[PDB]
Write an enzyme that holds these catalytic residues in place. Structure first.
Site, short mmCIF file in Angstrom:
data_model
loop_
_atom_site.label_atom_id
_atom_site.label_comp_id
_atom_site.label_asym_id
_atom_site.label_seq_id
_atom_site.Cartn_x
_atom_site.Cartn_y
_atom_site.Cartn_z
CB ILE A 12 -0.98 0.03 1.19
CG1 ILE A 12 -0.22 -0.18 2.50
CG2 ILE A 12 -2.10 -1.00 1.00
CD1 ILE A 12 -1.08 0.01 3.75
N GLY A 15 7.74 3.00 2.58
CA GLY A 15 8.32 3.43 3.83
C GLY A 15 9.78 3.78 3.63
CB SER A 16 12.17 5.62 5.77
OG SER A 16 11.81 5.05 7.02
CB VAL A 20 3.83 0.37 3.99
CG1 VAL A 20 2.73 0.28 5.05
CG2 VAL A 20 4.97 1.24 4.47
CG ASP A 124 10.97 11.96 4.50
OD1 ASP A 124 10.94 12.84 3.61
OD2 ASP A 124 11.04 10.75 4.23
C1 LIG Z 1 -4.35 3.56 2.59
N1 LIG Z 1 -2.88 3.67 2.79
C2 LIG Z 1 -2.18 3.47 3.98
C3 LIG Z 1 -0.83 3.68 3.73
C4 LIG Z 1 0.33 3.56 4.64
C5 LIG Z 1 0.47 3.59 5.98
C6 LIG Z 1 -0.62 3.34 6.93
O1 LIG Z 1 -1.81 3.12 6.73
N2 LIG Z 1 -0.12 3.42 8.26
C7 LIG Z 1 1.28 3.68 8.21
C8 LIG Z 1 2.21 3.84 9.24
C9 LIG Z 1 3.55 4.10 8.94
C10 LIG Z 1 3.91 4.18 7.61
CL1 LIG Z 1 5.60 4.51 7.22
C11 LIG Z 1 2.99 4.03 6.57
C12 LIG Z 1 1.67 3.77 6.83
C13 LIG Z 1 -0.78 3.98 2.33
N3 LIG Z 1 -2.03 3.98 1.78
#
Ligand SMILES: Cn1cc(/C=C2\C(=O)Nc3ccc(Cl)cc32)cn1
Ligand SMILES: [Cl-]
Length: 260
Positions: A12, A15-16, A20, A124
Site C-alpha cells: 500500500i 516506507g523509509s 508497507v 521527512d
Molecule cells: C491507505 N494507505 C495506507 C498507507 C500507509 C500507511 C498506513 O496506513 N499506516 C502507516 C504507518 C507508517 C507508515 Cl511509514 C505508513 C503507513 C498507504 N495507503
C-alpha cells in the site's frame, strides 16, 4: 503468507528503507499497516521504534507492535492503518483548494507542535507522509530519519530526507551545523506549496541543479491558480532561505491565513 497472527496482503505504500503492506490480524479481525524491513543502519530503525513507542497524539500514526526474529532476516513493524492514504500525490494537476489545504495544514501544525514538544525532529515531512484517517484528519507517518534531541532544539549535520523537501541550510558541502526545528518548518512550507499548486516549488531532475535551486533560486508563485495574498505571505515566510529569520511554529499558529 502468514507471520504469527498476521496475514500479509498487498503493498500500500513506500516506507523509509522498506515497503508497507496491508495486513489482516486474525486475532481481532482488523486490518493493520505492516512495514517490512530486510537487514542491509539497523541502529536507525531501533531509534525509530524507540521514538514511535513514546508518541501518542491524534495527528501522529501509532506503532502497534514489532515482530523481531533474531533468526529471520526480516523485521516487521505493525502500525495502525490510516485507511484513506496520502492526502495527495505530487505532482498532480488537481491540487487542493485553499479551504482544504488549510484544513489539512491545521492538522500538520498540531502534529509538528507535538513532535517538537516531545523533542522529535521529523525530517521527512511531505504529502506522501501525511495520511488521511477514517475521520478525514491527517496522521503524520514515517519516522525513519527522525532525530531526538535534548534541550531547546536539535543541532544537526547529516543530510537526510526527500531531496525536494530539504532545507537549504542542510545542503552545505562543509558539514556545517544547522538547527532542527527550522528544517521541519521548511518542509512544511514545501508541503503547503504542494497542497495548492500540485508540484514542488524547486524542481530539477539533476540533483546538483535541484540543490542549487533550493539554496539560491528565489521562490516564485505560478500565475495559476491564483492564491490569496496572505497564503503567499505564509509560504514565503516558511521558505525563507535563512533559518534564523524563518517563521517559527508558534508564529505559524497565529498567521492570519491559518486562523481565518
Ligand atoms: C491507505 N494507505 C495506507 C498507507 C500507509 C500507511 C498506513 O496506513 N499506516 C502507516 C504507518 C507508517 C507508515 Cl511509514 C505508513 C503507513 C498507504 N495507503
Ligand atoms: Cl510527497
Amino acid at each position: 503468507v502468514q507471520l504469527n497472527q498476521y496475514t500479509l496482503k498487498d503493498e500500500i505504500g513506500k516506507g523509509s528503507y522498506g515497503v508497507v503492506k496491508l495486513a489482516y490480524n486474525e486475532n481481532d479481525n482488523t486490518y493493520y499497516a505492516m512495514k517490512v524491513l530486510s537487514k542491509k543502519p539497523i541502529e536507525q530503525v531501533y531509534q525509530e521504534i524507540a521514538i514511535l513507542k513514546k508518541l501518542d497524539h491524534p495527528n501522529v500514526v501509532k506503532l502497534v507492535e514489532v515482530l523481531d526474529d533474531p533468526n529471520e532476516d526480516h523485521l516487521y513493524m505493525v502500525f495502525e492503518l490510516v485507511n484513506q492514504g496520502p492526502v495527495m500525490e505530487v505532482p498532480t494537476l488537481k491540487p487542493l483548494s485553499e479551504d482544504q489545504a488549510r484544513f489539512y495544514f491545521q492538522d500538520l501544525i498540531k502534529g509538528i507542535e507535538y513532535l517538537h514538544y516531545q523533542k522529535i525532529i521529523h525530517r521527512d515531512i511531505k504529502p506522501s507522509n501525511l495520511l488521511v484517517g477514517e475521520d478525514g484528519h491527517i496522521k503524520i507517518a514515517d519516522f525513519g530519519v527522525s532525530n531526538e534531541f535534548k534541550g531547546s532544539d536539535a543541532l544537526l549535520s547529516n543530510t537526510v530526507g526527500t531531496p525536494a523537501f530539504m532545507a537549504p541550510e542542510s545542503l552545505s558541502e562543509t558539514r556545517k551545523i544547522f538547527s532542527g526545528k527550522a528544517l521541519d518548518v521548511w518542509a512544511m512550507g514545501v508541503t503547503l506549496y504542494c497542497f495548492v499548486f500540485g508540484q514542488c516549488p524547486f524542481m530539477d531532475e539533476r540533483i546538483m541543479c535541484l540543490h542549487s535551486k533550493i539554496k539560491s533560486q528565489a521562490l516564485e508563485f505560478p500565475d495559476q491558480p491564483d492564491i490569496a495574498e496572505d497564503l503567499k505571505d505564509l509560504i514565503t515566510r516558511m521558505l525563507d532561505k535563512n533559518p534564523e529569520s524563518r517563521i517559527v511554529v508558534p508564529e505559524i499558529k497565529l498567521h492570519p491565513w491559518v486562523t481565518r
